[PDB]
Design a protein around this nucleic acid. Structure first.
Lengths: 806, 125, 213, 39, 823
RNA sequence: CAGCGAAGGAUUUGGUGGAUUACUAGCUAAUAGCAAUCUA
């Protein structure tokens, strides 16, 4: 109900590290932040791992059994994780900045390259239990003079070939009893050698410099030892090589440069196959699937990645994100796709089922401040600092209207009538609320009454009164329509940020600047109550500030709140690293999440390390600025218990999985999952259904729901009592959205809201998030299936009933 | 030295200052006792901050209230606003902040004009 | 059985408060004499249009109940009555005098008929509010009317106006003051005894509505 | 960019065949996204 | 017993036990190998962090350990384990049943000695490998030759000799020929310590009377004697940085530093380690270092540094007294009560029978530090009561954490043994809080709890009253008086709506806040000794005295579960943080797990010592148990988080066992069923031409098709066809080789007919038909009324007609859903 | 003034030691030697 585990991180599809496919070409592991995302390609899904690193991660690898991965950040704090259970296994501190880690093809030894030493360790087991010190060191080799840059194995786990910013590149045998087989050292490049590869048989050794040279070492004669046979070249002029990989069996080299270009070759012939670019910023990491069909290219600075199928040139997914510019958020009114408005001025449109974008909108010049959706799903409005509130259709995926002021003032918040007929925007420097008709783009009016900038706006979703909140310490209620234009002011203690009104349209939550959040019934002007939200938001002391985190007052308040969709719980987020959620009847905190636990962001820690302080200046203001942590806008989803929060590392999305919980409902001694399964096998289906709901174990709900047969679903759907309808309606929604038994689900929905439609009709707000997931399910799988089956019907009818032979 | 707190309270032009400190439980308006406050029919309008929440919260503090300006009803609204937010500020600073927002909940559930005056008027229709 | 001990030293403060006041701190009564609970609007259709669920001390709340439309149907009925009672050209503004004379009024209402005067005045309102009237429609400028029904806000407002101006007109040139005149008018209206001005005008208006129905 | 990065509180970050155009609009595999009035 | 849910992990918070440690050098570093009961531990000596532990325990307890350069030689019941980096590298089984007592390492010959004066010495097979692996010989000291053994060592510059130190005599050996060489003189009392000197060939040896003899073994004499009154000596050492300093350690907790150049006491140290736990078990100088590493039996290791002298001219005569330097300790008695501080499972709190409170850190084991008993001064004028001498607090019984307002005011509450009040603490700045919450009815504190909003504290006295307090002033708020004997458990909800009291009378009282009435009373038929509220799921589990664990949900006040099956008093519970399990440990030396949905007992570990306290971590990964004995605190890792476990009532279908449930393929053939997997296969198949046209930069199947054609069923063809990639599906289906007969087209349309006859994957069969229609429907429209393809299309539509109930259903459901969500 | 109150009470401030990130030992020319030395 309120146990939001960290579900996904939308946005920022790659930032820093090395992309890695799984063994089977199904999942792509991307080093997103201090966490690791996993993109499942075929089952078009994704998740992010719940564990976090203390800085940005810089090395990923999982063994070829796909069972456990390790991930290493900037100071070597390696963390390994059961990949099939998504939990942490062991933390470790390699003492210096690692560069690349590689499990063996055997997967029993992994070696990594910390600084100039390489070190082979042997792995722990998923099957052997969680030991205290699981890492047993195999050996450590020190044959280099500068930092290692890359690392590879043989196809068997016998030799390991390393290459460094020292001009040489060397080879090693993993046991102490193959020292004569490989001990030598390959000099000869001009610049940083960063590629060193065995061939498919281990006899050819391809080495790749930084300035585009490729040598082919081969153990041939003038006993005789590793003669370079050929110096092939690249000849990209100002593009030194940035990242190399080489699939051995299909014999495919892939090189990304500084110029934002990549080329893939068939190497033993040295034939250029593909040469093409992704942008003006370098390809930071190539990696390649084991079956050679797919490649993956990550460019860090624009934050983009691209998996490319090179046999048939068809892009599996190409994506681009942001960083620390995620300025606002919206959901589609069916909770299926998300809109991210970002401060460079662009409107990304993500979706929740996958993790990918599907449409940017690169239209605005300066920043986009706030967005929200309107008019039955498929209009969304975006409001900028260009002086523009512009509409967007989300079916043709185009602009269609652009309202401006009369003088180019920057806009800061907007709202829109739910009956999508008027659009209201508020600024920092005009003290007014601009109202535009939207069916005709002309400026309707400008309505005033404040004397400070209007911080936030909203429209009531039912009675269409508008609620604005401004730094006059004042909230103001306008009734616009219907011959009146009647204003009503309400004073509050400090100045206001972050209005958000309840889905009933009966009251308003405001987030004042003193760390408090008030609630006002709007039929009166009466305050219902307020939550002192100040002493429970941990505000991190920065790196450069000379006051404590306690006496600091940078973020001891909130800047965006939102209700839940039953009108019962306010989620709130600010310029601090805490996003809290409260429940308004009891007026109490019920959970506080921290958004990030890495010191790469600025305001995370409230207690900084003392050893970094010097005689003058801290040791992190010495350059060789740092981005703050903020949560700019937070929303609950319409169709889940899940909620999203747009922070500097993109959208965090937390969610409920009621799978892992015991969250029962007035059970007693007799009712037992064994008792429900015996009640089902003696077939009293209504009793077994409520006997499963009282357990509230969703796999019992799944089992009883599937084992009820079709010929009495009207009977049990009639006899089901009133207090279980929200549970069964939302269960049918969130199971049917990814299920398969479509006719079964639709029989169940037809039975349910035929037998008990009126109760929903007089309890609309009880089922507002319930039967929105059902309508999402309807219009986003079943209507499409009906569309194609009707297209088949009509194309058959035409291709039979018409004739012609010429 | 001694723990004190000074708050204000304003109706139309009357202004009330309240010095609340730790004491023995005496409530004085210009030296007069709180019982001897005219116009004698809004003595309960003066009483309701110390009557809504019980005198046990007033047992340890003593309040002295100066008033200037305004007529009779403006002075009694200024007195009750000053008494109320002086008690709230004393409990915000020196004792339980939980008791602070208990008192704030009580006063706001009764009427918030006993905590925040409604200043910015009129309207040009 | 069970107890809850909140206070641990009795109320002995330095300015010695009156005992009836520190007895009124347990529960709010109007004028420290009349408890607002066990007072019900006996009628339906005026419940949540005569505010009695929110107790007050005196009838001089200084809230704002004229800026919005229906929010004058939420300030409590006693000071609704005294604000209508202040209305005449001789005595505008004098709502402290209005408060004290309705204090004397409902005090003698209790000492005559002792249930509680707030219940007396609430069911006086419910019995005095007219349930139909007419409207002087044009009809070619003839003697033309048509019966309509009355919304409960207009019912409550017209009941309060009828009671107050009936008390004034019956206390114009008599020995009785406006206090006891309003008292006897409210008692007759509470019984519905067809004697007082407001119940007479109510039955007359419903009579002409039924006639021109 | 340089004047409004120093006038702000929060941090601001700043031939072959194709640059691949990774930031594409209009894409739910749409070809005729024009309105019938616009045709 | 072995388990199946929890695996034991480590006994944290434990430093030493009383076995004499050893030290080893590596370059210019120093490591201290100390024993903790059964496993050992390797600290370093510079920053005194932990470095290593044994990877798995020993069979018996370790009796004696030593250390060469990389290797640690542990010694228990019959064996000696040669270890490297805390991993065992070689066992050495001794050729006896006698229990080993001491050992030494020198050159090649390892030498261990049992408890009957029998000395097994071992030898390295190659004078180049790393550790002595091969049995060389067995010397045996007889009672003619001396007393029973007390130490042995090879002091320096001796060609393959050895020195056995008995209780009455010193006796050398030549270990190559197995020969005795020099028995010493007679000694008139029992000696108990002998450590060599860094000067040539002498050994200092201290007796049970407080004298140190300095035997010169080359001379065979004694050189000097340090006399000390009635001190049971325990541990000698020498300082080797040039300035000669002997250091004796007396088992009365004394450490005396003698000069030797002028026979003077430099400085005494009194009560350095506790007397009763053994005193100074082992104290040594690090060689070439002016520091001292002491270790007692009282779970404490200390370092004492000698400062440079202040007399720059005199120098060695004026010696500054030893400072105190880094030290690592735990509490020295078994811990009474145990809590987890934060949700991150980083800090945990112990309070022990020796009346100390510690904050252990189970992340990094140098962060563990004692909380401090220094009272905040009364700033109203009062004087601190108690005593004048600063004794430690009385024994801690119960305590309660709520990290919600941490460090902003007082944080945690505690409840001491048989004292009338209950002081509070702070966890962020780690000392005693300002206030002492009092019971106001003379009953001792038995239950403490606090709200998860961190304001209200809750004292439950032995006379039944429950006084609630505020924790940012320390004043009282209200006194709930319902019970008539000792209240044993208090809790309050998450959202502070209802609170639950739990007495020894069997009364469980459901009160609510904000209206101080009660609203429920329950009577159980036993006295109640514990209550654990699961604040997430509103259940709370109670001990009883008929050994039940009664789980009551707080909303409808039902007794919702009753876990039977224990044999003695249940000392502890904890909810799993999901609320699925109750882990409960009880005085029949057992610790059982209850799956509270099924009400069953999943597994019961038979633990050797009775676990007093059992606590799950805020996150479900660690189970910390504390026992009757052992100075540490044993933390347990649940394997249930990494693999799913059974649910099966033990006593000394698989889907409902393993709590999971797979979804069946279709309910019956009468129902439609979409494809298993992605729902974007439909859109990618319908649009993959324009998908690749927008994403461009600026046969086996026919074999199976005629196979299934001649066998007249296409199920194997459809099983092939469904599950491969959209690109390959379209590239295959685009070319279907149909010029005159169109047999292949009729086979394909009949294949889709047989496919959507089954009512399964019918979205995929619809889009395959639509893919064929866009592919080469032109030839179907061209030679339409070809008899074969017209028959295939006719019975294809005759089976397609059954799929109109789907659009009837969804166009019902969408319209009525829109109507009930708008109007 | 009062009371609190076990052989003192209450403050100012320096230094050292332990934390402030998650505990796999040091050095070097590193499949080994060193830790008393890498020299012949």
């Amino acid at each position: 109900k309120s146990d939001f585990k960290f579900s996904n991180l939308l946005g920022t599809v790659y930032r820093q590290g090395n992309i890695t496919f799984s063994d089977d070409g199904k999942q792509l592991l991307s080093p997103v932040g201090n966490r690791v995302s996993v993109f499942d390609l075929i089952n078009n899904k994704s998740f992010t791992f719940e564990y976090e690193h203390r800085k940005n991660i810089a090395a990923i690898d999982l063994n070829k059994q796909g069972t456990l991965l390790i991930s290493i950040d900037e100071d070597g704090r390696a963390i390994l994780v059961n990949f099939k259970a998504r939990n942490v296994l062991h933390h470790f501190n390699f003492k210096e900045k690692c560069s690349a880690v590689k499990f063996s093809p055997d997967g029993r030894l992994f070696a990594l390259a910390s600084g100039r030493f390489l070190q082979i360790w042997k792995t722990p087991d998923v099957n052997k239990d969680r030991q205290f010190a699981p890492f047993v060191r195999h050996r450590v080799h020190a044959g280099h003079f500068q930092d290692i840059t890359s690392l590879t194995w043989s196809q068997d786990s016998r030799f390991i070939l390393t290459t460094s910013k020292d001009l040489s590149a060397k080879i090693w045998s993993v046991d102490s009893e193959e020292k004569n087989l490989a001990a030598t050292t390959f000099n000869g490049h001009r610049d940083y050698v960063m590629g060193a590869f065995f061939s498919h048989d281990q006899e050819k050794i391809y080495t790749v410099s930084k300035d585009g040279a490729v040598f082919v070492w081969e153990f041939t004669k003038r006993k005789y030892s590793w003669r370079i046979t050929k110096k092939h070249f690249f000849y990209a002029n100002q593009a030194k090589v940035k990242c190399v990989t080489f699939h051995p069996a299909t014999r495919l080299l892939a090189v990304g440069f500084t110029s934002g270009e990549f080329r893939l070759y068939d190497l033993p012939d040295f034939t250029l196959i593909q040469q093409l670019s992704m942008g003006q910023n370098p390809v930071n990491t190539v990696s390649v699937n084991q079956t050679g069909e797919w490649l993956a290219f990550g460019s860090s600075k624009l934050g983009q990645l691209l998996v490319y199928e090179w046999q048939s040139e068809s892009y599996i997914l190409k994506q681009q994100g942001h960083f620390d510019s995620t300025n606002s958020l919206a959901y589609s009114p069916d909770g299926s796709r998300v809109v991210t408005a970002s401060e460079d001025g662009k409107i990304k449109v993500w979706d929740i089922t996958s993790g990918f974008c599907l449409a940017t909108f690169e239209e605005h010049t300066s920043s986009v401040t706030a967005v929200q959706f309107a008019k039955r799903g498929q209009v969304m409005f975006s409001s900028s600092l260009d002086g523009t509130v512009r509409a967007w259709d989300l079916i043709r995926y185009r602009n269609f209207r652009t309202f401006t002021g009369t003088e180019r003032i920057q806009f800061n918040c907007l709202a829109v009538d739910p009956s999508g007929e008027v659009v209201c925007a508020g600024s920092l420097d005009n003290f007014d609320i601009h109202v535009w008709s939207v069916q005709t783009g002309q400026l309707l009016d400008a309505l005033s009454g404040h004397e400070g900038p209007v911080s936030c706006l909203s429209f009531s979703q039912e009675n269409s009164v508008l609620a604005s909140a401004s730094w006059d310490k004042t909230i103001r209620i306008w009734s616009i329509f219907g011959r009146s234009q009647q204003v009503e002011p309400i004073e509050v203690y400090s100045d206001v940020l972050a209005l958000s009104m309840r889905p009933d349209g009966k009251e308003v939550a405001v987030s004042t600047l003193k760390g408090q959040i008030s609630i006002f019934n709007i039929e009166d002007a009466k305050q219902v109550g307020n939550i002192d939200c100040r002493k429970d938001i941990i505000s991190g002391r920065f790196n450069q500030d000379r006051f404590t985190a306690k006496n600091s007052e940078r973020s001891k308040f909130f800047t965006t709140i939102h209700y839940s969709f039953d009108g019962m719980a306010i989620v709130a987020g600010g310029n601090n690293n805490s996003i809290c959620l409260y429940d308004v009847p009891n007026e109490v905190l019920l959970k506080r999440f921290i958004v990030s636990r890495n010191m790469a962001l600025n305001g995370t820690l409230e207690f900084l390390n003392s050893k970094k302080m010097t005689e003058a200046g801290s040791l992190d203001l010495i350059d060789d600025m740092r981005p703050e942590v903020r949560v700019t806008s937070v929303q609950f989803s319409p169709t889940a218990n899940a909620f999203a929060a747009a922070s500097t590392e993109g959208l965090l999305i937390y969610s409920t999985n009621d799978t892992i919980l015991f969250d029962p409902f007035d059970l007693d001694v007799d009712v037992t999952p064994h008792s429900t399964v015996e009640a089902l096998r003696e077939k009293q289906f209504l009793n077994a259904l409520v006997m499963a709901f009282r357990l509230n174990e969703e796999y019992l709900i799944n089992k009883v729901y599937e084992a009820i047969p079709i010929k009495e679903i009207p009977l049990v759907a009639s006899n089901i009592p009133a207090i279980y309808l929200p549970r069964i309606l939302k269960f049918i929604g969130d199971f049917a959205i990814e299920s398969q038994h479509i006719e079964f689900n639709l029989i169940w929905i037809k039975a349910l809201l035929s037998a008990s439609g009126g109760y929903i009709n007089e309890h609309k707000y009880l089922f507002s998030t319930a039967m929105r997931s059902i309508q999402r399910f309807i219009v986003r799988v079943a209507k499409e299936v009906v569309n194609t089956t009707t297209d088949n019907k009509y194309t058959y009818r035409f291709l039979v009933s018409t004739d012609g032979s010429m | 030295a001694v723990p004190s707190v000074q708050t204000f309270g304003k109706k139309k032009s009357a202004t009330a200052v309240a010095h609340v400190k730790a004491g023995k439980g005496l409530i004085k308006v210009n030296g007069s006792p709180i019982t001897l406050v005219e116009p004698e029919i809004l003595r309960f309008k003066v009483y309701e901050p110390l009557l809504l929440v019980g005198l046990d919260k007033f047992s340890n503090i003593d309040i002295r209230v100066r008033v200037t300006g305004g007529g009779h009803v403006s002075q009694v609204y200024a007195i009750r606003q000053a008494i109320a937010k002086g008690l709230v500020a004393y409990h915000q600073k020196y004792v339980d902040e939980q008791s602070k927002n208990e008192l704030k909940k009580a006063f706001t559930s009764y009427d918030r004009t006993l905590l925040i005056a409604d200043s910015r008027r009129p309207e040009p229709k | 059985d069970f107890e809850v001990v909140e206070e641990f030293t009795p109320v002995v403060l330095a300015t010695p408060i009156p005992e009836e006041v520190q007895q009124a701190q347990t529960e709010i009564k109007l004028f420290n004499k009349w408890s607002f609970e066990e007072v019900e609007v006996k009628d339906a259709s005026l419940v949540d249009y005569v505010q009695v669920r929110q107790p007050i001390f005196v009838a001089h709340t200084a809230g704002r109940y004229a800026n919005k439309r229906f929010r004058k149907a939420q300030c409590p009925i006693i000071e609704r009555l005294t604000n209508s009672l202040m209305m005449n050209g001789r005595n505008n503004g004098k709502k402290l005098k209005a408060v004290r004379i309705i204090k004397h009024t409902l005090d003698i209402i209790n000492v005559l008929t002792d249930q509680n005067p707030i219940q007396v005045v609430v069911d006086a309102i419910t019995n005095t509010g007219p349930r139909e009237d007419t409207t002087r429609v044009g009809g070619g400028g003839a003697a033309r009317r048509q019966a309509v029904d009355v919304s409960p806000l207009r019912r409550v407002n017209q009941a309060i106006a009828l009671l107050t101006i009936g008390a004034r007109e019956a206390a114009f040139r008599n020995i009785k003051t406006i206090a006891e005149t309003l008292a006897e008018e409210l008692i007759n209206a509470a019984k519905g005894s067809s004697t007082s001005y407001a119940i007479k005008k109510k039955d007359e208006l419903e009579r002409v509505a039924k006639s021109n129905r | 960019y340089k004047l409004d990065v120093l006038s702000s509180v929060h941090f601001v970050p700043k031939t072959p065949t194709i640059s691949m155009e990774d930031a594409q609009p209009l894409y739910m595999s749409n070809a005729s996204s024009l309105a019938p009035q616009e045709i | 017993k072995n388990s199946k849910i929890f695996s034991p992990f480590r006994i944290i918070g434990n430093v030493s036990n009383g076995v004499p440690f050893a030290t080893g050098t590596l370059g210019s570093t120093f490591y201290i190998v100390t024993c903790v009961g059964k496993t050992f531990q390797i600290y370093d000596a510079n920053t005194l962090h932990l470095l290593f532990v044994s990877e798995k325990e020993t069979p018996s307890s370790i009796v004696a350990l030593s250390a060469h350069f990389h290797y640690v030689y542990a010694a228990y019941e019959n064996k000696v384990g040669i270890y490297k980096r805390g991993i065992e590298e070689h066992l050495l089984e001794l050729e006896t049943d006698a229990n080993v007592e001491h050992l030494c390492i020198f050159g090649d010959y390892l030498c261990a000695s049992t408890d009957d004066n029998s000395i097994f010495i071992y030898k390295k097979s190659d004078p180049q490998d790393k550790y002595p692996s091969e049995f060389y010989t067995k010397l045996t000291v007889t009672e003619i030759q001396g007393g029973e053994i007390v130490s042995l060592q090879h002091l320096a510059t001796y060609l393959n000799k050895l020195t056995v130190v008995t209780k009455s005599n010193v006796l050398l050996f030549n270990v190559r020929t197995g020969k005795l060489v020099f028995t010493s003189n007679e000694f008139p009392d029992q000696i108990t310590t002998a450590e060599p000197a860094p000067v040539l060939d002498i050994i200092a040896l201290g007796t049970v009377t407080g004298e140190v003899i300095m035997f010169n073994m080359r001379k065979g004499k004694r050189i000097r004697t340090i006399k000390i009154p009635q001190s049971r000596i325990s541990s000698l050492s020498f300082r080797t940085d040039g300035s000669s300093h002997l250091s004796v350690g007396t088992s009365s907790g004394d450490l005396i530093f003698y000069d030797l150049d002028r026979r003077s006491r430099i400085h005494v140290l009194k009560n350095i380690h506790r007397e009763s736990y053994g005193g100074v078990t082992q104290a040594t100088f690090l060689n070439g270092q002016p520091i001292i590493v002491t270790s007692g039996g009282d779970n404490s290791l200390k370092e004492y540094v000698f400062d440079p002298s202040l007399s720059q001219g005199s120098g060695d005569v004026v010696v500054q007294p030893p400072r105190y330097l880094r030290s690592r300790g735990g509490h020295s008695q078994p811990p009474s009560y145990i809590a987890f501080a934060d949700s991150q499972s980083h800090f945990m709190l112990s309070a022990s029978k020796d009346r100390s409170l510690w904050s252990f850190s189970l992340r990094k084991d140098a962060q563990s530090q004692e909380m401090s008993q220094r009272l905040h001064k009364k700033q109203d004028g009062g004087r601190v009561g108690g005593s004048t001498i600063k004794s430690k607090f009385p024994e801690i019984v119960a305590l309660a954490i709520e990290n919600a307002r941490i460090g902003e005011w007082e944080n945690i509450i505690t409840a001491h043994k048989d004292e009338k009040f209950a002081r509070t603490w702070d966890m962020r700045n780690k000392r005693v809080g300002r206030w002492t919450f009092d019971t106001t009815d003379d009953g001792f504190v038995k239950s403490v709890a606090m709200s998860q909003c961190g304001n209200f504290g809750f004292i439950g006295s032995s006379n039944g009253s429950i006084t609630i307090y505020n924790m940012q002033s320390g004043i009282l708020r209200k006194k709930y008086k319902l019970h008539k004997r000792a209240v044993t458990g208090i809790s309050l909800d998450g959202m502070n709506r209802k609170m639950v009291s739990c007495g020894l009378d069997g009364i469980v009282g459901f009160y609510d806040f904000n209206k101080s009435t009660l609203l429920g009373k329950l009577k159980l038929d036993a006295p109640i000794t514990a209550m654990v509220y699961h604040r997430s799921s509103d259940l709370f589990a109670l001990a009883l005295d008929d050994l039940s664990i009664v789980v009551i949900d707080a909303v409808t006040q039902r007794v919702v579960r009753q876990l039977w099956g224990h044999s003695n008093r249940i000392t502890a519970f904890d909810f799993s943080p999901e609320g699925r399990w109750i882990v409960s440990a009880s005085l029949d030396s057992t610790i059982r797990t209850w799956d509270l949905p099924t009400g069953g007992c999943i597994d019961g570990i038979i633990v050797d010592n009775v676990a007093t306290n059992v606590k799950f971590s805020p996150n479900g990964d660690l189970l910390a148990t504390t026992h009757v004995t052992g100075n540490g605190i044993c933390i347990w890792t649940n394997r249930a988080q990494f693999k799913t476990v059974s649910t099966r009532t033990i006593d000394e279908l698989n889907d409902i066992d393993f709590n999971t449930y797979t979804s069946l393929e279709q309910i019956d053939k009468e129902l439609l069923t979409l494809s298993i997997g992605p729902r974007s296969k439909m859109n990618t198949l319908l649009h993959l031409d324009v998908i690749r046209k927008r994403s461009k930069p600026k046969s086996h199947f026919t074999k199976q098709l005629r196979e299934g054609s001649q066998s007249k069923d296409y199920s194997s063809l459809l099983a092939t066809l469904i599950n491969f990639s959209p690109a390959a599906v379209d590239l295959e289906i685009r070319s279907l080789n149909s010029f005159e007969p169109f047999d292949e087209i009729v086979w394909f349309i009949d294949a889709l007919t047989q496919g959507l006859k089954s009512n399964k994957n019918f979205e995929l069969y619809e889009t395959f038909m639509s893919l064929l229609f866009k592919a080469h429907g032109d030839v179907i429209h061209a030679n339409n009324k070809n008899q074969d393809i017209a028959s295939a299309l006719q019975n294809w539509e005759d089976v397609h007609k059954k799929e109109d109930r789907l659009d009837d259903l969804v166009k019902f459901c969408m319209g009525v859903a829109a109507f009930v969500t708008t109007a």
